[PDB]
């Protein structure tokens, strides 16, 4: 991970 979202 390390990214974000939310999906
Ligand atoms: C997502 O990242 C932001 C920026 O660093 C934080 O401020 C936030 O608390 C964080 O969201 C938490 C809560 C969430 C959305 N339910 C997920 O569990 C994420 C991984 O962590």
| Alpha carbons 3 and 6: distance in angstroms, whole number | 10
Distance 4 CA to ligand 1 centre (A): 8
Chain-centroid distance, C-alpha 7 = 8
> Cα 4 to the chain's mean position, in Å?
2
How was it solved? X-ray
* Helices and strands, counts by H and E, the chain: 0, 0
| Both structure tokens of 3 | 């990214």
Q: Token pair of 1, please?
A: 């991970």
DSSP string, 1-7: --S----
- Ligand 1 centroid vs 1 CA: distance in angstroms? 12
Q: What's the number of CA atoms in the CB half-sphere (13 Å) around residue 2?
A: 0
């Amino acid at each position: 991970x390390x990214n974000x979202x939310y999906x």
